[PDB]
Structures are given as C-alpha cells and as structure tokens.
Amino acid sequence: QQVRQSPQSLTVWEGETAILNCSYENSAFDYFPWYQQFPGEGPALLIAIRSVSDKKEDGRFTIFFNKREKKLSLHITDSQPGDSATYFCAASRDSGQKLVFGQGTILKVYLHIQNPDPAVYQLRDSKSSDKSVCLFTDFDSQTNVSQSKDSDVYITDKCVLDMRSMDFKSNSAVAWSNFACANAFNNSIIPEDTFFP
C-alpha cells in the first residue's frame, strides 16, 4: 500500500521519548500531516511538515523528514499518559487536502506505580451472592496480564484508574467464570509478594 507505518503498536514508560516511523512511495507528495486519534473520537491534526522542509518542532512533538529515503519520523519527548492514542502518518499532493493514511501506530504510555501492592481479591454480586469475580489490583504497570489458556474463563486486559480526590493511581484486571481466584491468574506472571486473602 501507499503509506507504511511502524510499529503497529508501541509501548513506552512516561518521560521516555517515543519514536513513530512512516514511509511513503509516491514522490509527488508535497505535504505530510500527522493525525492523533483518542478512543471514541475522530482523528485530529497533531503536527505536519511539507516536502521543502527537513524537520519541524512543536512542543515535545517533532517531525523528521528524509526526502531522499522517502522516510518520515515523529518524535514525542517525555511521553505522558495523556499521549496514549493512535497516531497516523498521512500524505497529500494537495497541501493536506486529500489524505492517504498509514495503518496507524498505537501508542501506550505506562504509569510508574508509586507503591505497588499486588493483591487478588474476590467480589460477590450485589443481587445474587452465588456469583463472584476476581480482581487483580495495585500491581505495577510492568507486568503483563495474558489472556486465558481456555474458554469458560475470561480475563480482561489491564487498565489504570485515578482517584483524583486523593493523589493515587492503580492498575486492575478482572477475571470471571461459570472456579477459584487462586488459580485465576496462573497463566500470567504475578509478583511472589502478591497478597491472597
């Protein structure tokens, strides 16, 4: 296809410089915009360079352009959690009017957990106490919660929440079935100091 991007997904720790790559084939593109898309929204123009220039800086966001190698690059300095979005490299022959997009790069910026306290709690249903769920929480962002090694058992991906009344962020993942919570997250790695009440 016309505009290629890499990688398909990129994960970075907060404060780190994230680098997104893009390459095109047509030599008649006179303008290269980068569009940012947050979940649930439409894409919005982030930063853009035209073929006559070799670079452009705009507060943490920088485009490097190599007209010879047909290569483009987006540099995001001290990446922040709010920078987690999908990034599209785009090309235009009409100064930004008729865009061909890349496949897009998905960027995830990991939070540093102040005081990790990994524990697996279990929660009963408010309506029918015969149902329950397992909750992995207060773990550091470094760990990976891989999916189930079977059906009948489901495991959500991790997510971070922010109690703004305090000053506190925490990761969390949920499992359910029909089992026990002790063997719920076996397929993933858990810190040996994980609390099992």
Binding site: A44, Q103, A119, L161, S172
Partner: protein, 238 residues
C-alpha cells in the same frame, strides 16, 4: 463543526443505508472515510463542492451525494457485511493544511439480525479484604452477552456521573472467540475510599448504553426487542 448521523446503526444485508454529514465550517471539500484494523483510514468518496462528487480509493459498494455546501451523504444502497466499519466524515478548505473530522459512525451490517442482544449488567461489591488492607473500595461492573459491541459504559454515584477513580476496558472481549458470530463482554472498575463505601446513604450504579435496533425495524422473535436502551445495575453502601 462536523456532525454525522447516525452515530450508530444496525443493518440487515441488502438494506439501504444512508450516512449523512453536515458541516458548519463553510468548507468546500468534504470527505467520507472508513476505519478498519490494519487498514487505517481509507477514502471512499469526496467532493469539491455542491453538485459534484469524486470516487476515492475504495469507492466500490458506495455512492455519494453533495446536494448542499453543508451536506455530504454516503449511500449504501445494498448493504453487505463487508461494509461493517466506523465511518468518518471530514471537511477541508481549498488546499487546506488540515482536515476536520466528525466523531464517527459505528455501522454494523448484519445478515440474520437474530444475533442482536442487549447486555446483562451486574455490579460486584468491594471485598472486605481490600477494604481491610488498602483502605479503599473497588466496585466492578460486568456487562455480558451483547452484540454488536456498540456501547458506552459509565458510573453514577448519587445521581451524578463520575470519572475520577474509574477505568473501563479499552475494548469488549469475545465470549466465544472462535465464532465471529460471538457476542461480547465488558468490565469496569470504580474505586473509592473505604469510608465512602461504608456509607449506607451512598449508592453506586454501573450504566451501559446499548445501541441496537430502532423500533420501526421488524422483529419476528419471541424475546424482547433488542432496541437501543440503558441497562443498569446498582449497589448500596453497607
């Protein structure tokens, strides 16, 4: 501004589907893109002004119309499951450096329509151990057995919608990952202080906004109609 309509739509195969997009920006150029995984954004049709349209990179299956400067319509006269996607409209000026997109349109072109289901919602109460260890209370909402994945989940504490202390999954998971005919599941987490949960006056409800059939769609099934609806589950402090 750029508004699209509808924002969500369920269609049977062979049905006619029109997606309209109206623009305030007084721009001459208007566009209709679609977004799919591993393809990014792809141009379907565009327009340089009223009364004129042009074919994009993937025009096959679609027809467009620019009857007004403000309006640009994408027409699916014979809907096919291949046209299941998220459609974005956009407007731009002459040789403009930016394109102004709409919020998007979630379109599901089904065949049978008998696979459409609203979600069942359950809220699960904070564990005593968590409240006794970390001094905080995590409520977990769980929406299951719904199709298509056109939903919006939110938390409501004491009649007011909250965002702080909330995290939902980035995307629903498949209950039976084998079938693409499968229905989905979605979870969310609300986290508050142990004192707050201990308050019997406070009540918390997880609300999912399911987007399904319109009422003037033909329903031949026994079960209740899978229309667009709010499904809730609530828990009271103990």
């Amino acid at each position: 501004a750029v508004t699209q309509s509808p924002r969500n739509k369920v269609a049977v195969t062979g049905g006619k589907v029109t997606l309209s997009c109206n623009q305030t920006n007084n721009h001459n150029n208007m566009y209709w893109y679609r977004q799919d995984t591993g393809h990014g954004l792809r141009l379907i049709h565009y327009s340089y002004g009223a009364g004129s349209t042009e074919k994009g990179d993937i025009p096959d299956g679609y027809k467009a119309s620019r009857p007004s400067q403000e309006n640009f319509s994408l027409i699916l006269e014979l809907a096919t499951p291949s046209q299941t996607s998220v459609y974005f409209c956009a407007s731009g000026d002459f040789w403009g450096d930016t394109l102004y997109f709409g919020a998007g349109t979630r379109l599901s072109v089904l065949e049978d329509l008998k696979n459409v289901f609203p979600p069942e919602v359950a809220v699960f109460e904070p564990s005593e151990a968590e409240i006794s260890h970390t001094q905080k209370a995590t409520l977990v909402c769980l929406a299951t057995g719904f199709y298509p994945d056109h939903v919006e989940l939110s938390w409501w504490v004491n009649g007011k919608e909250v965002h702080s202390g909330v995290c939902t999954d980035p995307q629903p998971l498949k209950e039976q990952p084998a079938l693409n005919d499968s229905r989905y599941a979605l979870s969310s987490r609300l986290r508050v202080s142990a004192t707050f949960w201990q308050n019997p006056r406070n009540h918390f409800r997880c609300q999912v906004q399911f987007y399904g059939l319109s009422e003037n769609d033909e329903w031949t099934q026994d079960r209740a109609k899978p229309v667009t609806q709010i499904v809730s589950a609530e828990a009271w402090g103990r």
